[PDB]
């Protein structure tokens, strides 16, 4: 038993769900809204299992979606370790591995404070296993990467580290006795009772290593916030190419020609000596760490990538074969970007007719390009990163162009103009990135609160026998207060799904309701719009009538920008004003950058405003191809897929202001489209406990009076309310 939070009851329902998974042995779906303790109650049942002496093989890899939430999972798992470590008396060891790669890497001051992740890790690996593997020992070239050599020493040895560590625990241990996040991460993957990281590593058929053994029906995988999986399984394996990246790929390719040209006959013989070893060999020592950086296993739903380096017989012969893959690609890409065209067999069959080669050297050219510089290795990833984007695009053609498509949007179509052309090559059936995950492990359990419409869940085409919702029995319903404002028989103008600045009735209603809510909300207000086009037209219209000027009198304005550099500095100013002075207001987009995972609470933003249904632009041809393929599997579900993606992002912007129970958040759906759809693909605990009362056909005048009930009754819960259990589960 884990004495901490009051008993609803809730752990009794989560205990039965974890028992049928091991018996049925399949994927399970569990609804865990943000209003219920999905961390204290979950981690209390998970360590009872870590002590499963009977259960022969028991694992957990647990993920999340943001780098702060990793740390959140850590700390919460810390304390439940604390208490029944105290309670059960004699403590058995533990490990939870927050495995953060790039952005949490290097302790050398020369390397660390350059801003990006990938390029600087290329400088790191170029130093470690490109200059100090080639120049294998020296005095200046072979840089003081001294604790990699300390890893060499204690990787020969056997330590036993203590427990689950933070991200900064491993940097502080970097200073003291913990070594490299990567390499200690390797030694601790060798035995780890719990590794916590992001699910983007597993759901990416490229550099995914599965960090598992050869067992295909063992281990336990637990996902977190896996509601938005339809796009991750497609955007991960998606590849693209622009004229700017293609121009740099051709410029850096000429530098490689001058490297081989200046090689005489003595050094040239050493390059051909390793070519024979790679053919007769198959377990090369370079497959331990350099595989994770370069394209590891692009054919994840198939087998591993290991061939007898085809398409090469000499060193200079491989350069001409790769040069034809660049001089012909620039001639085929520029000729198809003149007009619009969408045909998967146009690029697959067109490339084979021009370049008269086989599908074997074009498939393995990505791995051979990395091994080409391993022999000379005097290079570095800064000059190799533009060459990787071209080799990654060719890999998705020899064994993936038989089920994908090519979208060409050159002349003004959600893409840059003629100054920077771009082509699209994504997927449709979001199941190729999750099928190897279900086959490599035993059972995978996803935990999402906003994922409530389960009728559209078979989009992934995967079985799910474990299905259960969550109601959370609560005495006082002052936790949340969903409200729907849609004017009605007074103006009926509140929706704008295909209108820009043609009318001023809907824009005026959005400013009149927001101005009144800015004086009654006790803290901050976190509003969201539809897209970037309708958001800029609404703010610009308030400058003429004089609506945004009155908002500046009370709260401070915060609008999401476009660049990622000015976005991080804008959120820090919002968190400082809401905690020190008066809570400000957020005017962003439902799919912007403050909607992925901010975890803002009461002292940051306890009010949620939704301006219309957050739909998507289906007129674009980058999304129509993803929906056209659904008609081959589901004909009648051509419209329900758009409703799911619209209500999922709407609940995601709502399921963030509250985390425990005493947060008391407020959400507003100021749109008339929320009429009958609020009783189907919505939260089951909102229909019976909130949406039962008549509060859907409200207007601007009525929406303020209803909002006063949540802002006035909230002052009563102050001393004690729903306190059941008495730290003993009520003897249940």
């Amino acid at each position: 038993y884990f004495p901490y939070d009051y008993i609803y009851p809730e752990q009794f329902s989560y205990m039965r769900e974890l028992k049928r998974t091991l018996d049925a042995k399949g994927h399970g779906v569990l609804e865990m809204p943000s209003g219920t303790g999905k961390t204290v109650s979950l981690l209390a049942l998970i360590m009872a299992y870590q002590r499963a002496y009977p259960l022969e093989v028991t694992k957990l890899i647990y993920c999340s979606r943001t780098v702060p939430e990793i740390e959140k999972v850590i700390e919460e798992l810390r304390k439940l370790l604390n208490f029944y470590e105290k309670q059960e008396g004699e403590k058995l060891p533990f490990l939870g591995l927050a495995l953060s790669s790039r952005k949490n890497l290097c302790i050398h001051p020369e390397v660390t404070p350059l801003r990006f992740g990938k390029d600087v890790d290329g400088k790191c690996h170029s130093l470690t296993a490109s200059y100090v593997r080639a120049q294998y020992q020296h005095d200046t070239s072979l840089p003081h990467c001294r604790f990699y050599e300390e890893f060499d020493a204690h990787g020969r040895e056997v330590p036993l580290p203590a427990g689950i560590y933070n991200l900064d625990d491993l940097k502080a241990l970097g200073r003291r006795q913990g070594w490299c996040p990567y390499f200690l991460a390797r030694y601790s993957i060798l035995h780890a009772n719990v590794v916590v990281y992001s699910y983007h590593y597993l759901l990416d058929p490229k550099i995914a290593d599965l960090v598992s053994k050869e067992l295909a029906r063992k281990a336990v995988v637990v996902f977190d916030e896996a509601h938005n999986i339809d796009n991750v399984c497609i955007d991960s394996m998606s590849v693209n190419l622009t004229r700017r990246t293609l121009d740099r790929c051709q410029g850096n390719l000429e530098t490689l020609q001058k490297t081989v040209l200046r090689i005489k006959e003595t050094d040239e013989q050493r390059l051909r000596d390793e070519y024979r070893r790679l053919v007769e060999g198959l377990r090369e020592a370079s497959a331990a760490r350099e595989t994770d950086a370069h394209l590891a296993n692009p054919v994840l739903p198939d087998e591993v990538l290991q061939e007898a380096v085809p398409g090469s017989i000499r060193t200079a012969e491989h350069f001409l074969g790769f040069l034809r893959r660049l001089l012909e690609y620039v001639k085929w890409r520029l000729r198809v970007q003149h007009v619009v065209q969408e045909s998967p067999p146009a690029f697959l069959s067109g490339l084979a007719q021009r370049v008269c080669i086989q599908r074997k050297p074009l498939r393995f050219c990505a791995e051979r390009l990395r091994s080409l510089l391993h022999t000379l290795e005097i290079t570095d990833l800064a000059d190799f990163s533009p060459l990787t984007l071209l080799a990654n695009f060719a890999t998705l053609v020899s064994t993936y162009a038989k089920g994908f498509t090519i979208i060409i949007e050159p002349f003004d179509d959600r893409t840059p103009t003629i100054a920077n052309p771009i082509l699209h090559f994504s997927c449709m059936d979001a199941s190729l990135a999750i099928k190897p995950v279900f086959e490599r492990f035993q059972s995978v359990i996803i935990t999402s609160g906003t994922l409530s419409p389960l009728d559209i869940y078979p989009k992934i085409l995967d079985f799910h026998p474990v299905t259960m919702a969550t109601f959370t029995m609560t005495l006082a319903r002052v936790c949340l207060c969903p409200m729907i404002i849609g004017r009605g028989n007074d103006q009926v103008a509140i929706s704008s799904k295909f209108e820009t600045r043609e009318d001023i009735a809907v824009i005026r209603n959005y400013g009149n309701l927001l101005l009144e809510m800015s004086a009654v909300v006790p803290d901050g207000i976190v509003a969201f719009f539809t897209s970037y086009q309708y958001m800029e037209s609404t703010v610009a219209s308030w400058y003429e009538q004089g609506i945004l000027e009155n908002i500046q009198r009370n709260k401070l304005l915060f609008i999401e920008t476009q660049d990622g550099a000015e976005t991080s500095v804008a959120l820090e100013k919002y968190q400082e004003a809401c905690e020190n002075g008066r809570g400000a207001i957020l005017l962003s987009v439902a799919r912007g950058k403050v909607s992925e995972g901010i975890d803002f609470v009461h002292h940051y933003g306890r009010a949620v405003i939704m301006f219309g249904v957050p739909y998507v632009y289906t007129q674009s041809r980058i999304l129509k191809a993803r929906l056209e393929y659904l008609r081959d599997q589901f004909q009648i579900r051509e419209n329900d897929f758009l409703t799911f993606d619209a209500m999922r992002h709407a609940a995601q912007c709502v399921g963030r202001a509250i985390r425990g129970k005493t947060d008391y958040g407020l959400m507003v759906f100021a749109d008339k489209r929320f009429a009958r759809g609020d009783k189907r693909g919505k939260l089951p605990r909102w229909i019976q406990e909130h949406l039962t009362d008549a509060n859907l056909n409200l207007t601007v005048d009525e929406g303020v009076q209803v909002a006063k009930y949540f802002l006035r009754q909230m002052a009563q819960p102050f001393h004690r309310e729903d306190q059941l259990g008495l730290s003993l589960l009520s003897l249940e």
């Binding site: 017989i313 001409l320 008269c356």
Partner: protein, 155 residues
């Protein structure tokens, strides 16, 4: 563009960026200006050696296809007599070891190697084989059967 040279007129690339360039059989690049200028003066002779040009064997293009002279010759030698070898070898081989010789013999053929006379003796060896074209005829017949079958489903 202007670094590869120009035969007769020599003053054409500096007059129009979108110039229509053509190729031949021996391995040269002549624009559309040198085609009409040489016909009114002579005929179809190579400006360097002696290659006759009788039939309309010119590939007109304005996208500047022959960028590098090394990569344009290896694409024509394979789709001539080496493309037909993609079927005879699999009928006797058993492992991926002889396919490296085909990729290697076409790389050195451009760099002036005496082994060019060796491959010419195999073309004159046997005079009865045909094939290749007979294989493409079966693929076209099966394609028309699928279109007719797909049309019946629509009906």
């Amino acid at each position: 563009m202007d670094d590869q040279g120009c035969p007769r007129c020599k003053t054409t690339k500096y007059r129009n960026p979108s110039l229509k360039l053509m190729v031949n059989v021996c391995g040269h690049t002549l624009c559309e200006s040198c085609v009409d200028l040489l016909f009114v003066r002579g005929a179809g002779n190579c400006p360097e050696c002696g290659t006759p040009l009788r039939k309309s064997n010119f590939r007109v293009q304005l996208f500047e296809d022959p960028t590098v002279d090394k990569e344009v010759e290896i694409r024509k030698k394979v789709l001539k007599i080496y493309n037909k070898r993609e079927e005879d070898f699999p009928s006797l081989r058993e492992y991926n070891d002889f396919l490296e010789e085909v990729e290697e013999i076409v790389f050195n053929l451009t760099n002036n190697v005496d082994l060019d006379n060796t491959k010419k003796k195999m073309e004159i060896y046997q005079k009865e084989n045909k094939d290749v074209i007979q294989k493409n005829k079966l693929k076209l017949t099966r394609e028309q059967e699928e279109l007719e079958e797909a049309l019946e489903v629509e009906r």
